Symmetry: C6
Subunit: 29 residues, 6 copies
């Protein structure tokens, strides 16, 4: 239902932020 849909969109948000954090780390060294 709708609460699961919210949780799934939040999981997608976490995945994009993890990619951004990865690239941050890479830039730093």
């Amino acid at each position: 239902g709708e609460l699961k849909a919210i949780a799934q969109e939040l999981k997608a948000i976490a995945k994009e932020l993890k990619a951004i954090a990865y690239e941050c780390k890479a830039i730093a060294q």
Copy 2:
């Protein structure tokens, strides 16, 4: 209802973050 509106806005947020992740990588 409003729970669907919340999920739709979160989907929009995820798409914008995906774009940001791409561009940041391209700029770098």
Copy 3:
């Protein structure tokens, strides 16, 4: 009510991230 207020704040969050994405893309090219 309160669920509508939450959706409205998420809409504001989405708009600010769209502004950031736009600038990122402008800078990139």
Copy 4:
């Protein structure tokens, strides 16, 4: 109540993203 507390924290999040978007714009000029 807790739903109002959630909305308030989302308002704080939008404000910080607005600041970040501002700096992006400043960087672009």
Copy 5:
């Protein structure tokens, strides 16, 4: 309960974004 837990994580998120905004301003 879980609604309080959600509000607390959102507070932590706002705090990290405040740090990012600060660092943004400083790096620039």
Copy 6:
């Protein structure tokens, strides 16, 4: 349940943002 799942994804989001904040400062 589903509210716990939401809280857990939000915790993960806070973690990734803390990492971004940390690496930024280094840069």
